[PDB]
Specification:
Keywords: Antimicrobial, Bacteriolytic enzyme, Cytolysis, Glycosidase, Host cell lysis by virus, Host cytoplasm, Hydrolase, Viral release from host cell. The chain is mainly alpha-helical. The protein has a single domain, classed as Lysozyme. The protein is built from nine helices and three strands, in the order H-E-E-E-H-H-H-H-H-H-H-H. The protein has a three-stranded antiparallel sheet. A hairpin with a 2-residue loop joins strand 2 and strand 3. The chain is elongated, with a radius of gyration of 16 Å. Bound molecules: chloride ion (2 copies). One chloride ion binds next to helix 9.
Length: about 160
Protein backbone atom coordinates (compact mmCIF):
# COMPACT_ATOMS: atom_id res chain seq x y z
CA UNK A 1 0.00 0.00 0.00
CA UNK A 2 1.09 3.53 -0.21
CA UNK A 3 0.30 6.99 1.25
CA UNK A 4 -2.01 7.75 -1.60
CA UNK A 5 -4.12 4.71 -0.90
CA UNK A 6 -3.96 5.35 2.82
CA UNK A 7 -5.19 8.86 2.58
CA UNK A 8 -7.76 7.99 0.01
CA UNK A 9 -9.14 5.56 2.57
CA UNK A 10 -9.01 8.07 5.47
CA UNK A 11 -10.40 11.01 3.61
CA UNK A 12 -12.73 9.65 0.99
CA UNK A 13 -13.35 11.46 -2.30
CA UNK A 14 -16.11 14.07 -2.76
CA UNK A 15 -16.55 16.05 -6.05
CA UNK A 16 -18.73 18.77 -4.64
CA UNK A 17 -17.89 21.17 -1.79
CA UNK A 18 -18.55 19.62 1.70
CA UNK A 19 -17.86 20.26 5.35
CA UNK A 20 -15.20 18.21 7.05
CA UNK A 21 -15.35 16.66 10.60
CA UNK A 22 -14.72 20.23 11.96
CA UNK A 23 -17.40 21.89 9.77
CA UNK A 24 -14.79 23.51 7.30
CA UNK A 25 -15.35 23.75 3.57
CA UNK A 26 -13.50 21.02 1.75
CA UNK A 27 -13.49 19.23 -1.60
CA UNK A 28 -11.81 16.32 -3.19
CA UNK A 29 -9.65 14.08 -1.13
CA UNK A 30 -9.56 16.11 2.04
CA UNK A 31 -8.55 19.33 0.27
CA UNK A 32 -9.44 22.05 2.75
CA UNK A 33 -10.58 25.24 1.00
CA UNK A 34 -11.31 27.56 3.87
CA UNK A 35 -11.89 27.90 7.65
CA UNK A 36 -14.35 30.57 6.90
CA UNK A 37 -18.07 30.11 7.44
CA UNK A 38 -18.78 31.48 3.96
CA UNK A 39 -19.65 29.24 1.11
CA UNK A 40 -18.84 32.10 -1.23
CA UNK A 41 -15.38 32.45 0.19
CA UNK A 42 -15.07 28.65 -0.25
CA UNK A 43 -16.25 28.84 -3.91
CA UNK A 44 -13.81 31.57 -4.55
CA UNK A 45 -10.89 29.63 -3.11
CA UNK A 46 -12.09 26.64 -5.16
CA UNK A 47 -11.91 28.57 -8.46
CA UNK A 48 -8.54 29.99 -7.53
CA UNK A 49 -7.22 26.55 -6.77
CA UNK A 50 -8.51 24.88 -10.03
CA UNK A 51 -8.02 27.84 -12.31
CA UNK A 52 -11.57 27.90 -13.55
CA UNK A 53 -15.03 28.93 -12.71
CA UNK A 54 -16.21 25.79 -11.09
CA UNK A 55 -19.36 26.59 -9.25
CA UNK A 56 -18.48 24.20 -6.33
CA UNK A 57 -18.06 21.10 -8.48
CA UNK A 58 -14.83 19.49 -9.74
CA UNK A 59 -13.93 16.50 -11.76
CA UNK A 60 -12.05 13.44 -10.70
CA UNK A 61 -8.97 14.49 -12.49
CA UNK A 62 -8.99 17.91 -10.81
CA UNK A 63 -9.49 16.14 -7.44
CA UNK A 64 -6.46 13.97 -8.16
CA UNK A 65 -4.39 16.91 -9.04
CA UNK A 66 -5.11 18.75 -5.82
CA UNK A 67 -4.34 15.41 -4.07
CA UNK A 68 -0.91 15.06 -5.58
CA UNK A 69 -0.11 18.59 -4.72
CA UNK A 70 -1.29 18.20 -1.17
CA UNK A 71 0.71 15.04 -0.63
CA UNK A 72 3.73 16.71 -1.99
CA UNK A 73 3.32 19.78 0.23
CA UNK A 74 2.97 17.50 3.33
CA UNK A 75 6.21 15.70 2.60
CA UNK A 76 7.81 19.01 2.00
CA UNK A 77 6.57 20.44 5.19
CA UNK A 78 8.09 17.49 7.03
CA UNK A 79 11.47 17.82 5.43
CA UNK A 80 11.48 21.42 6.10
CA UNK A 81 10.45 21.14 9.77
CA UNK A 82 13.28 20.98 12.39
CA UNK A 83 11.20 18.87 14.76
CA UNK A 84 9.70 16.68 12.08
CA UNK A 85 12.53 15.87 9.76
CA UNK A 86 14.76 13.96 12.14
CA UNK A 87 11.81 11.83 13.10
CA UNK A 88 10.76 11.05 9.66
CA UNK A 89 14.32 10.24 8.66
CA UNK A 90 14.62 7.80 11.54
CA UNK A 91 11.54 5.83 10.56
CA UNK A 92 11.05 2.92 8.27
CA UNK A 93 8.94 3.25 5.08
CA UNK A 94 5.71 2.06 6.58
CA UNK A 95 5.87 4.34 9.57
CA UNK A 96 6.88 7.37 7.46
CA UNK A 97 3.51 7.05 5.73
CA UNK A 98 1.83 7.24 9.10
CA UNK A 99 3.61 10.53 9.83
CA UNK A 100 2.59 11.96 6.45
CA UNK A 101 -1.04 11.06 7.21
CA UNK A 102 -1.04 13.03 10.35
CA UNK A 103 0.66 16.03 8.75
CA UNK A 104 -1.87 16.04 5.95
CA UNK A 105 -4.67 15.94 8.49
CA UNK A 106 -3.44 18.40 10.91
CA UNK A 107 -0.72 20.42 9.52
CA UNK A 108 2.91 20.61 10.21
CA UNK A 109 2.53 22.90 13.11
CA UNK A 110 -0.10 20.70 14.82
CA UNK A 111 1.95 17.52 14.44
CA UNK A 112 5.17 19.25 15.53
CA UNK A 113 3.28 19.89 18.87
CA UNK A 114 3.28 16.11 19.69
CA UNK A 115 6.81 16.51 21.17
CA UNK A 116 6.60 13.61 23.54
CA UNK A 117 5.21 11.21 21.01
CA UNK A 118 7.80 12.31 18.48
CA UNK A 119 10.58 11.63 20.88
CA UNK A 120 9.18 8.22 21.52
CA UNK A 121 8.84 7.45 17.89
CA UNK A 122 12.41 8.59 17.43
CA UNK A 123 13.45 6.10 20.20
CA UNK A 124 11.45 3.34 18.55
CA UNK A 125 9.28 2.76 21.66
CA UNK A 126 6.18 1.83 19.70
CA UNK A 127 3.96 0.83 22.53
CA UNK A 128 4.72 3.87 24.56
CA UNK A 129 4.27 6.24 21.58
CA UNK A 130 0.95 4.65 20.81
CA UNK A 131 -0.31 5.36 24.30
CA UNK A 132 0.98 8.94 24.32
CA UNK A 133 -0.53 9.58 20.82
CA UNK A 134 -3.98 8.42 22.08
CA UNK A 135 -3.95 11.12 24.78
CA UNK A 136 -4.94 13.87 22.39
CA UNK A 137 -7.83 15.82 21.10
CA UNK A 138 -7.03 14.23 17.65
CA UNK A 139 -7.77 10.74 19.02
CA UNK A 140 -10.88 11.77 20.88
CA UNK A 141 -12.21 13.62 17.85
CA UNK A 142 -11.37 11.13 15.16
CA UNK A 143 -10.90 7.85 16.96
CA UNK A 144 -11.36 5.41 14.03
CA UNK A 145 -8.86 7.19 11.95
CA UNK A 146 -6.45 7.91 14.79
CA UNK A 147 -6.50 4.24 15.79
CA UNK A 148 -5.54 3.19 12.21
CA UNK A 149 -2.58 5.60 12.24
CA UNK A 150 -1.55 4.57 15.79
CA UNK A 151 -1.70 0.87 14.89
CA UNK A 152 0.47 1.61 11.96
CA UNK A 153 3.05 3.20 14.15
CA UNK A 154 2.75 0.37 16.67
CA UNK A 155 3.05 -2.50 14.22
CA UNK A 156 5.04 -1.15 11.28
CA UNK A 157 2.51 -2.84 8.90
CA UNK A 158 -0.61 -1.70 6.93
CA UNK A 159 -2.74 -4.25 8.62
CA UNK A 160 -5.19 -1.67 10.04
CA UNK A 161 -6.03 -0.78 6.43
CA UNK A 162 -5.91 -4.26 4.89
CA UNK A 163 -9.50 -5.12 5.48
CA UNK A 164 -10.90 -1.66 4.60
CL1 LIG B 1 -4.49 25.04 -3.97
CL1 LIG C 1 -12.24 8.82 12.66
Amino acid sequence: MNIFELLRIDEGLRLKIYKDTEGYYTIGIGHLLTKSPSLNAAKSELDKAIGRNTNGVITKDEAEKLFNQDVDAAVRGILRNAKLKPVYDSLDAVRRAALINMVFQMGETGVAGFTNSLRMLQQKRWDEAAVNLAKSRWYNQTPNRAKRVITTFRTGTWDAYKNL
